């Protein structure tokens, strides 16, 4: 009766979606073939797979997501790898020529020829499900497909389905390192679409994942194949209350109203804790207070900002595991006592909790330990304006010499969108400072 649909865009999206769906296989016990194991001859244990996996009369479970990318090379590893029989032959959309780190190639010239093919399967996955909350978007700012094609996908989806929910997990550019050069162009020019054609948008920074995975899990030199496990661990704790039973359930509609106070303010921030190794797990006791303190600690913060310099507007607790509600209230009443953490004076109740019973599972070869309880943050704070300020300063000095303009003008779009995208943000940063100003 409940279903969820995920749309993963770009090379970032198709690579985090592989680790996202292998965990979904392991929570419901789905083998890479696509069924219950043949050792178990009677099944249908609980209809928690109905929201993530389809049902066929032969006993096969098919996922309810779609993968889109303009690069065929990273897509066909799913066709070649272990999970070839599990994923549908149609649910993985393949391009022919990549956008090549550009916005106009992904938007106006190549994004048009495949925007109708995906929408057919989006409609096909929409009438399968009786009840749909909305769509999850796993896209990247720096990618050509994740910027250009997404800036037409969210626009067309908003008129394809009016009041449907729209959640985004965006791979935000890191403030120090980057794999490209023209990523401020790819980041700014897609913000004009996403500020009006999205409901909620969590940001993920890779270099903050780099330090967190290094200093906490005691694993030096990580790889993307384990970062996507961490991001895939975040996605399961959000949708845990939908699938699994809990003391009180949080919907996909519950936190989209409790983290977005203004239509121009829809940028929360994610944080996961505890993140410890197997060797560190058994020495340290893991209390509810000791896992909620690291969440509010800016050292464990997953986007490279500081709430000490900023101020929160809203937060969201995702408690999953062996947790009782008594010390949850003792923890959050203790959080309200420290004056180092500062809230705004107009949102005196900034808490929403969600309780799930089943502790998180672990994967063979993964980095995280077998843990009994965990908590995920979805907090909205104004410290992102610190990150936006240093992103536009780089954008303004890069545009002052009119570099890389010929890569965009000759593709078909006009040069007036460059000035508008800089100005529309400048009003948005003015909106960011005005909500932070108290009475």
């Amino acid at each position: 009766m409940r279903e969820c649909i995920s749309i993963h865009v770009g090379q970032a999206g198709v690579q985090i979606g592989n680790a996202c769906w292998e965990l979904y296989c392991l929570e419901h016990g789905i083998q890479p073939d696509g069924q219950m194991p043949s050792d178990k001859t009677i099944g249908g244990g609980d209809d928690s797979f109905n929201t993530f996996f389809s049902e066929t009369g032969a006993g096969k479970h098919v996922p309810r997501a779609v993968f889109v990318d303009l690069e065929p090379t990273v897509i066909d590893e799913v066709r070649t790898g272990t999970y070839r029989q599990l994923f549908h032959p149609e649910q993985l959309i393949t391009g022919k020529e990549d956008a090549a780190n550009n916005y106009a190639r992904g938007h106006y010239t190549i994004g048009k020829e495949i925007i109708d093919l995906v929408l057919d399967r989006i409609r096909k996955l929409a009438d399968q499900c009786t009840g749909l909350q909305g769509f999850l978007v796993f896209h990247s700012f720096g990618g050509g497909t994740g910027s250009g094609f997404t800036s037409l996908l969210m626009e067309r989806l908003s008129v394809d389905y009016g009041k449907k929910s729209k959640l985004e997990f965006s791979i935000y550019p890191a403030p120090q390192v980057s794999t490209a050069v023209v990523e401020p162009y790819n980041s700014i020019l897609t913000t004009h679409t996403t500020l009006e054609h999205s409901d909620c948008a969590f940001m993920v920074d890779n270099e903050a994942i780099y330090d967190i995975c290094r200093r906490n899990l005691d694993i030096e030199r990580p790889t993307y194949t384990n970062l996507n496990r961490l991001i895939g661990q975040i996605v399961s704790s959000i949708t845990a209350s939908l699938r699994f039973d809990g003391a009180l359930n949080v919907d996909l509609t519950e936190f989209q109203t409790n983290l977005v106070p203004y239509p121009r303010i829809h940028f929360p921030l994610a944080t996961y804790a505890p993140v410890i190794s197997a060797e560190k797990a058994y020495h340290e006791q893991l209390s509810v207070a000791e896992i909620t303190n690291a969440c509010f600690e800016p050292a464990n913060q997953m986007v490279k900002c500081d709430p000490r310099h900023g101020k929160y507007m809203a937060c969201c607790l995702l408690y999953r595991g062996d947790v009782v509600p008594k010390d949850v209230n003792a923890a959050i009443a203790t959080i309200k006592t420290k004056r180092t953490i500062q809230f705004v004076d107009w949102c005196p109740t900034g808490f929403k909790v969600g309780i799930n019973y089943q502790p998180p599972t672990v994967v063979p070869g993964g980095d995280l330990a077998k843990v009994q309880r965990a908590v995920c943050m979805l907090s909205n704070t104004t410290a992102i304006a610190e990150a936006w300020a240093r992103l536009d300063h780089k954008f303004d000095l890069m545009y002052a010499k009119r570099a890389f303009v010929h890569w965009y003008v000759g593709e078909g779009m006009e040069e007036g969108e460059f000035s508008e995208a800089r100005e529309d943000m400048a009003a948005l940063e003015k909106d960011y400072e005005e909500v932070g100003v108290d009475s």
């Binding site: 050792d39 178990k40 009677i42 244990g45 609980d46 039973d245 019973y357 009994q372």
Partner: protein, 193 residues
């Protein structure tokens, strides 16, 4: 188990669950049917799952075509109390159905009688591999229960040969049932069978 601590200690301490048992522990699945008086609406096949972690039983019924009832789930990861009553003022800790489930054992769950009829292949592999807990899966004891009647073992050969009319090694499960109950020993349980 939360309120033991008031007399264990003057100041209570949180109850400590079995970290060891949660750490090593898969799911033991049994086929069951409902047993009451003769009613035509109740011919429903359920599946019982013992989780082996927190010692917990969950019963579910798969959705069946053109049936008048559609019950997706019967119990939600909750422990089962045996029908022995004695609910209040019980000095000992309460009794809970442990993991002792054979084929043919009628289990009384929540007042509803459930007859166990079949086990999953993983469950039967568990039965034959772990036998110190379950003496009903011993092949040696199963054949020792048959060795007590060696006087009729000669006649049993002609009894089998009467069924073997086409000179094959080929007999039915229902036939192999009815000779082993026509022995009328009464000691051949369904699990041993």
């Amino acid at each position: 188990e939360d309120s033991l601590r008031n007399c264990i200690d003057l100041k209570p301490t949180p109850h400590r669950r079995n970290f060891k048992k949660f750490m090593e522990k898969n799911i033991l699945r049994f086929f069951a049917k409902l047993v009451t008086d003769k009613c035509v609406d109740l011919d429903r096949m359920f599946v019982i799952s013992y989780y082996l972690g927190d010692d917990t039983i969950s019963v579910f019924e798969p959705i069946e075509r053109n049936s008048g009832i559609a019950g997706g789930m019967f119990l939600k990861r909750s422990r089962v109390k045996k029908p022995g009553q004695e609910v209040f003022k019980s000095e000992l800790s309460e009794y809970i159905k442990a993991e002792e489930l054979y084929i043919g054992v009628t289990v009384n769950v929540n007042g509803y009688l459930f007859r166990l009829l079949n086990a999953d292949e993983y469950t039967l592999n568990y039965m034959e591999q772990n036998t110190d807990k379950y003496p009903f899966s011993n092949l040696k004891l199963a054949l020792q229960k048959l060795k007590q009647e060696e006087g009729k073992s000669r006649e049993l050969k002609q009894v089998f040969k009467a069924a073997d009319s086409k000179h094959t090694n080929m007999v039915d499960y229902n036939t192999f049932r009815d000779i082993l109950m026509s022995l009328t020993v009464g000691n051949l349980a369904e699990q041993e069978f």
